[PDB]
Design a protein around this motif. Structure first.
Motif, PDB file in Angstrom:
ATOM      1  N   UNK C   6      44.405  35.627  46.107  1.00 25.79           N
ATOM      2  CA  UNK C   6      44.677  36.832  45.305  1.00 25.79           C
ATOM      3  C   UNK C   6      46.147  37.208  45.250  1.00 25.79           C
ATOM      4  N   UNK C   7      46.965  36.742  46.195  1.00 22.68           N
ATOM      5  CA  UNK C   7      48.399  36.993  46.146  1.00 22.68           C
ATOM      6  C   UNK C   7      49.135  36.034  45.220  1.00 22.68           C
ATOM      7  N   UNK C   8      48.462  35.000  44.716  1.00 24.77           N
ATOM      8  CA  UNK C   8      49.065  34.049  43.783  1.00 24.77           C
ATOM      9  C   UNK C   8      50.273  33.351  44.405  1.00 24.77           C
ATOM     10  N   UNK C  29      45.416  40.537  37.942  1.00 21.04           N
ATOM     11  CA  UNK C  29      45.728  41.909  38.332  1.00 21.04           C
ATOM     12  C   UNK C  29      46.334  41.893  39.733  1.00 21.04           C
ATOM     13  N   UNK C  30      47.273  42.786  40.049  1.00 15.11           N
ATOM     14  CA  UNK C  30      47.783  42.853  41.422  1.00 15.11           C
ATOM     15  C   UNK C  30      46.707  43.290  42.402  1.00 15.11           C
ATOM     16  N   UNK C  31      46.871  42.862  43.656  1.00 15.65           N
ATOM     17  CA  UNK C  31      45.896  43.203  44.688  1.00 15.65           C
ATOM     18  C   UNK C  31      45.789  44.710  44.877  1.00 15.65           C
ATOM     19  N   UNK C  35      42.095  46.655  44.995  1.00 13.62           N
ATOM     20  CA  UNK C  35      41.576  46.610  46.358  1.00 13.62           C
ATOM     21  C   UNK C  35      41.246  48.004  46.878  1.00 13.62           C
ATOM     22  N   UNK C  36      42.069  48.996  46.547  1.00 11.05           N
ATOM     23  CA  UNK C  36      41.863  50.361  47.007  1.00 11.05           C
ATOM     24  C   UNK C  36      41.145  51.231  45.984  1.00 11.05           C
ATOM     25  N   UNK C  37      40.763  50.672  44.835  1.00 17.56           N
ATOM     26  CA  UNK C  37      40.103  51.465  43.804  1.00 17.56           C
ATOM     27  C   UNK C  37      38.655  51.774  44.157  1.00 17.56           C
ATOM     28  N   UNK C  38      38.019  50.937  44.975  1.00 12.27           N
ATOM     29  CA  UNK C  38      36.642  51.139  45.373  1.00 12.27           C
ATOM     30  C   UNK C  38      35.627  50.290  44.639  1.00 12.27           C
ATOM     31  N   UNK C  39      36.051  49.490  43.665  1.00  9.12           N
ATOM     32  CA  UNK C  39      35.127  48.631  42.950  1.00  9.12           C
ATOM     33  C   UNK C  39      34.647  47.498  43.854  1.00  9.12           C
ATOM     34  N   UNK C  40      33.478  46.925  43.566  1.00 11.47           N
ATOM     35  CA  UNK C  40      33.023  45.769  44.343  1.00 11.47           C
ATOM     36  C   UNK C  40      34.035  44.635  44.283  1.00 11.47           C
ATOM     37  N   UNK C  41      34.263  44.001  45.433  1.00 16.06           N
ATOM     38  CA  UNK C  41      35.274  42.953  45.510  1.00 16.06           C
ATOM     39  C   UNK C  41      34.799  41.645  44.898  1.00 16.06           C
ATOM     40  N   UNK C  42      33.485  41.407  44.865  1.00 16.76           N
ATOM     41  CA  UNK C  42      32.968  40.154  44.327  1.00 16.76           C
ATOM     42  C   UNK C  42      33.230  40.009  42.838  1.00 16.76           C
ATOM     43  N   UNK C  43      33.599  41.092  42.156  1.00 18.85           N
ATOM     44  CA  UNK C  43      33.959  41.016  40.747  1.00 18.85           C
ATOM     45  C   UNK C  43      35.322  40.379  40.520  1.00 18.85           C
TER      46      UNK C  43
END
Ligand SMILES: [Mg+2]
Ligand SMILES: [Mg+2]
Ligand SMILES: [Mg+2]
Lengths: 139, 483, 201, 50, 71
Positions: C6-8, C29-31, C35-43
RNA sequence: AAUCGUACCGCAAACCAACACAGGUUAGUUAUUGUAAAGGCUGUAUAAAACCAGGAUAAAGGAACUCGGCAAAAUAGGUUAUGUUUUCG
């Protein structure tokens, strides 16, 4: 007359299907022929006894011809010599089965592993399509 | 240390070695070759090559009286040679002198042509020519205790058991100790050379011929008869023109033939070749100059020696003389005549015991091979043909072969009533009636001859007998009446 | 088909020591944004392994092994990582993954390591100097560098001769014997025919 | 040591030791057969079968 | 047991390595039948005598086997 | 070329021990470097008493235990310059 029998019911041989004589559970080398579910009285009887596990290259074996040349002249040593030759012949029947069972196990493991890889691929592809739809719906 | 899953190689080295030593059928060999050919080290790759020519002959002998060989086998035999040939090229740079001998011989024995191997051998032959023909050259030593890093690339020392090796004391005053090794490699290069690698092979052999000719010494152990034949055919096939080298090669052959006859006492018995007798020992094998007595071992099932001939025999004389006919123009007439006379003396002395004739068995193929060379060379001799006819069975020969043999005997001026009677008697028993004369088949020829063809064979036999001057006998009278 | 973290900045490696996932969202998209938005990470990332997990690991080992065979002197793990990536492209991400591959090679004697000499055990344990690795052109049956292998063989050769003659002196066979077991059945015959068909095709 | 295993069956031993051919070979054995006939036992020897 | 006190009897397949022929020889370009007839006619009918042979000549003796040094 | 054996159990719940008995029972073969292919087998429902059995760890002391180092623990292995005793091994 043929030397070896070629028409076997392989479901019976592996053990998934019952035989023509269910009372016999572990056929002897000379009992395989009549326990075969595909037995027919019209087929000619082979000139030699082989189990279903024997390879087709055994039709060129002549074991008693070689034994006669190695025959000791002393009867006391001859009797022991013959006894070990019969032991060698019987053991050869169960070396073929062991190779038969190990060989099939490897083929089964390869096929099972291949199926496992394909199933995971389909699941991952399906999820990716679902993920794409979520992004497209949100614009 | 070798437990678990190996991420680099599919099979352990030790297990692969076990399978190779356990091969008895081509199908088993194909199973190993087609799976792990890319993981063999030079020791393993060359071992398979040597076995394959023997496995092909074994299967041809497994066929019973009423069966036939499976047609799918010969195609598979050549398929396996090609696959192993490619791997031989890949690991060629890490082979020893002995390993290169094994791989080259297998392809040459099978008459399989491979451009990749021929090119690799061409460079190796140039490198070895200047090293093995040097006067200050030492024999190959198998007693290695601390191998060098380059010797660890041969795969010999990657073993979990004792490595067999020769226990002989290497000669310290030998001249050109490895001449036989060079002769075999050169012959293989000529045979394996293909269409796109013929020029390279010829150039390498020409340099060898020049180096061989410009040499003022002879190897202390004279080259074996087999090695001399191989080198002669290497020049003949490659088309190398060098009379100096050719004459020297025939000189060595002449010297060896004289030495064998000089050191022979007729009182002992018929002449026999000198051979190397190899026996198995605790640390390997040992080579002796004379045989042991038969021995009973408590552990070994077979104590018989492996006999490696060093002197000439009828088999080798039919190959050396064949090469001479091809290279006739490059050999002085005087040397050719001397060798021919020595060949006759070798044959005559090898089939005589005490003061009585003791024929030595020969086959029809061998007799024709020797006679064919003589016809090309125009050499006529009764001392070379008479021993060959006494030792030739005449029971399974076709009628045509018997007629040819009778003609040959008359032309060579053979004077032996027994030989003539044994031929006419066999021919008469093969000439049958029905009103058409039929000549039977046999080893000598393919098919039967009926009608005029049978009559022609009878006329030739009668003409040969009449010129020979045999007294009238029942067998000849019946043949004349039929014809 | 390497995939980036994810850091590319690097590719994720197929082993249990990898703690970074693979970015797989259709858009970059930047991490920090997601990451802190609360959306599921598997997306956004794939935390699992690929269907060819075992085959990829074997391929990577061959690339490392072949590169070492081309080298003429022992080198560090960092040099190995740079050399492989330059030759083939960005396929390896960390030096720890390469170390794991090397350990497997060392166990099976496909490679060797050159270790320094230390005056005391504690100095050796606390040392941080990187190690040097080499490769064997063919698999051997002894550990260590070619000099060490030659020494080990010499000791082994002497032991074999000692044992063989002791057996002979005490009325045992110099060389052990066994019986040949037949390992060619109808299954093996059919495998060979299948192999020829694949080779022909 | 564990006891109670004094019987180790053997078919050849049983026939040779207590068989009918053995009982008829001596005067005392013949008297044993008569005693068993007098009492009227249905099986005379361990060796008997139909 | 698994450990044998001596080599097992030769009951398995035995691959023979004796009398292997791999030498090079000439072709089959022999003379024609007519040429042989002409040669025989040219033979002079020399009135020579036969050699003195033993009354009984033993049959051919088999040759001993040979191996190769490519061990 | 006739005649007799050929199913099933056979380190075992089917043989010898009164038993579905922790005992007894001959020979032949097989995978496995630090491991191990084939084949074979399978346990009513819980837990945070005393006490008993078989294990593990233990501060400071180290035979003070006891008829008695019983039991338990313990660098246990290899090569040595020198010395002692020998029936000279
Ligand atoms: Mg049964
Ligand atoms: Mg304590
Ligand atoms: Mg006290």
């Amino acid at each position: 007359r043929p030397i070896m029998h070629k028409n076997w019911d392989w479901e019976f041989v592996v053990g998934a299907k019952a035989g023509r004589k269910p009372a016999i559970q572990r056929p002897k080398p000379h009992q395989w022929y009549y326990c075969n579910p595909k037995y027919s009285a019209e087929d000619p009887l082979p000139t030699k006894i082989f189990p279903p596990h024997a390879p087709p290259t055994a039709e060129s074996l002549d074991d008693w011809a070689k034994f006669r040349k190695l025959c000791p002249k002393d009867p006391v040593e001859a009797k022991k010599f013959r006894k070990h030759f019969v032991r060698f012949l019987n053991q050869r029947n169960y070396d073929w089965r062991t190779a038969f069972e190990r060989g099939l196990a490897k083929e089964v493991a390869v096929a099972k592993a291949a199926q496992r890889a394909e199933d995971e691929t389909k699941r991952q592809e399906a999820w990716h399509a679902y993920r794409t739809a979520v992004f497209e719906s949100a614009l | 240390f070798h437990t678990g899953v190996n991420l680099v190689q599919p099979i352990d080295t030790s297990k692969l070695t076990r399978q190779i030593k356990k091969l008895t059928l081509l199908h088993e060999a194909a199973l190993t070759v087609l799976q792990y050919s890319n993981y063999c080290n030079p020791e393993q790759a060359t071992e398979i090559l040597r076995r394959l020519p023997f496995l092909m002959r074994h299967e041809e002998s497994r066929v019973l009286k009423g069966q036939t060989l499976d047609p799918k086998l010969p195609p598979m035999f050549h398929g396996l040679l090609h696959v192993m040939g490619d791997r031989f090229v890949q690991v060629f740079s890490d082979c020893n002198l002995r390993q290169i001998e094994r791989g080259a011989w297998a392809l040459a024995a099978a008459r399989h042509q491979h451009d990749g191997v021929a090119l690799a051998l061409s460079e190796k032959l140039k490198q070895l020519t200047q090293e093995l023909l040097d006067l200050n050259a030492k024999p190959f030593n198998t007693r290695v205790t601390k191998p060098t890093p380059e010797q660890l690339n041969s795969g010999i020392f990657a073993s979990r058991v004792l490595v067999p090796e020769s226990v002989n004391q290497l000669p310290v005053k030998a001249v050109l100790p490895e001449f036989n090794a060079l002769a075999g490699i050169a012959w293989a290069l000529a045979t394996v050379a293909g269409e796109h690698s013929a020029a390279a092979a010829k150039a390498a052999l020409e340099q060898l011929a020049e180096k061989f000719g410009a040499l003022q010494v002879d190897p202390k152990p004279l080259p074996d008869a087999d090695s001399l034949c191989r080198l002669a055919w290497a020049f003949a096939k490659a088309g190398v023109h060098n009379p100096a080298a050719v004459d020297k090669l025939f000189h060595l052959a002449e010297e060896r033939l004289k030495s064998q006859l000089q050191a022979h006492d007729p009182a002992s018995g018929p002449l026999r070749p000198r051979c190397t007798y190899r026996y198995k020992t605790v640390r390997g094998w040992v080579d002796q100059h004379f045989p042991r007595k038969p021995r009973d071992s408590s552990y070994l099932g077979d104590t018989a020696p492996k006999i490696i001939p060093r002197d000439f025999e009828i088999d080798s004389l039919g190959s050396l003389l064949s090469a001479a006919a091809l290279l006739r123009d490059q050999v002085p007439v005087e040397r050719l005549q001397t060798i021919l006379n020595l060949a006759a003396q070798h044959t005559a002395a090898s089939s005589v015991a005490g003061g009585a004739l003791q024929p030595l068995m020969v086959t029809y193929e061998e007799v024709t091979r020797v006679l064919a060379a003589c016809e090309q060379l125009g050499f006529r001799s009764s001392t070379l043909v008479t021993p060959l006819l006494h030792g030739l069975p005449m029971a399974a020969l076709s009628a045509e072969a018997l007629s040819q043999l009778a003609a040959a005997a008359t032309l060579h001026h053979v004077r032996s009533r027994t030989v003539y009677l044994r031929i006419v008697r066999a021919f008469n028993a093969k000439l049958s009636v029905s009103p058409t004369l039929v000549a039977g088949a046999g080893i000598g020829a393919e098919g039967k001859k009926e009608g005029e063809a049978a009559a022609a064979l009878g006329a030739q036999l009668l003409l040969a007998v009449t010129k020979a001057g045999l007294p009238a006998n029942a067998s000849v009278s019946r043949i004349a009446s039929l014809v | 088909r390497p995939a980036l973290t994810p850091s590319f900045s690097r590719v994720s490696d197929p082993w249990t020591g990898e703690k970074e996932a693979k970015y797989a969202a259709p858009y970059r998209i930047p991490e920090e944004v997601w990451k802190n938005s609360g959306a599921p990470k598997i997306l956004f990332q794939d935390p699992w392994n690929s269907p060819d997990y075992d085959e990829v690991r074997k391929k990577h080992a061959v690339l490392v092994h072949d590169y070492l065979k081309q080298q003429s002197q022992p080198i560090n793990v960092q040099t190995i990582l740079e050399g492989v990536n330059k030759t083939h492209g960005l396929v390896l991400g960390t030096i720890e993954y390469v170390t794991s591959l090397l350990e497997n090679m060392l166990w099976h004697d496909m490679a060797y390591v050159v270790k320094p000499v230390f005056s005391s055990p504690r100095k050796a344990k606390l040392s941080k100097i990187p190690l040097l690795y080499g490769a064997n052109k063919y698999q051997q049956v002894f550990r260590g560098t070619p000099k060490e292998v030659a020494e080990r063989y010499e000791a082994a050769r002497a032991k074999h001769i000692k044992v063989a003659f002791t057996r002979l002196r005490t009325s045992k066979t110099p060389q052990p014997f066994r019986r040949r077991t037949d390992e060619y059945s109808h299954v093996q015959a059919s495998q060979s025919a299948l192999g020829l068909a694949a080779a022909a095709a | 040591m564990k006891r109670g295993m004094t019987y180790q069956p053997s078919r050849k031993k049983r026939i040779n030791k207590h068989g009918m051919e053995k009982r008829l070979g001596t005067e005392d054995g013949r008297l044993t057969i008569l005693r068993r006939l007098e009492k009227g036992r249905w099986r005379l020897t361990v060796d008997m079968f139909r | 047991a698994k450990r044998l006190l001596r080599e097992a009897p030769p009951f398995t397949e035995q691959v023979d390595e004796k009398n292997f022929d791999d030498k090079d020889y000439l072709g089959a370009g022999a003379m024609s039948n007519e040429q042989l007839r002409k040669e025989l006619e040219k033979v002079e009918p020399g009135e020579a005598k036969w050699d003195e042979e033993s009354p009984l000549i033993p049959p051919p003796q088999p040759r001993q086997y040979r191996n190769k040094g490519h061990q």
